[PDB]
Ligand binder design. Structure first.
Ligand code: HEM
Length: 153
């Protein structure tokens, strides 16, 4: 359970992200795919991209980055009361996209790296710790739905 003070830190940096959703989403997916190449293989849509320059040039990758960050933003702004938003996401990522919880850890590390790069004055250690807690709460709740469905592994 995050405290109100921890949520305020999370949402204050998140408000900065919402000024350039697409730029952040590109940086976060490119970092995920470079750091953890197994993740790129889950996207039939992107598995043709072989270089960071090709990733940066892909408008369809930039579009998906916006989709991802808009869904994450809607979850964060619920401050934990996010059951309605997580249900469908867990369901599609377990049963259709086949994404292991570990890959949600990896994309959480990529988000935190990008926020620190782009927003260092609003992403000191207090805020990094709070964002880490928010993203762990996301993963915990998705993992419980995966387990329900037979995918926690
Ligand atoms: C913060 C974490 C994430 C969020 C909020 C998120 C969000 C979304 C949303 C909103 C969609 C489209 C609606 C749907 O299918 O449910 C989607 C699609 C998808 N996601 Fe995620 N996602 C996340 C992490 C991941 C990770 C880590 C992977 C792979 C490693 C992944 C793989 C996919 C795939 C393969 C699709 C379908 C893309 C396509 O072919 O159109 N997601 N995601």
């Amino acid at each position: 359970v995050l405290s109100e003070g921890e949520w305020q830190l999370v949402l204050h940096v998140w408000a900065k992200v919402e000024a350039d959703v697409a730029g952040h989403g590109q940086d976060i997916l490119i970092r995920l795919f470079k750091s953890h190449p197994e993740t790129l293989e889950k996207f039939d849509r992107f598995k043709h991209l072989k270089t960071e320059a090709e990733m940066k040039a892909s408008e369809d990758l930039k579009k998906h980055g916006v989709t991802v960050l808009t869904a994450l933003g809607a979850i964060l702004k619920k401050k934990g009361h996010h059951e309605a938003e997580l249900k469908p996401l867990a369901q599609s990522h377990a049963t259709k996209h086949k994404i292991p919880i570990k890959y949600l850890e990896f994309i959480s590390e990529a988000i935190i790296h990008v926020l620190h790069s782009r927003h260092p004055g609003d992403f000191g250690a207090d805020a990094q710790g709070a964002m880490n807690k928010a993203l762990e709460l996301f993963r915990k709740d998705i993992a419980a739905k995966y387990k329900e469905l037979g995918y926690q592994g």
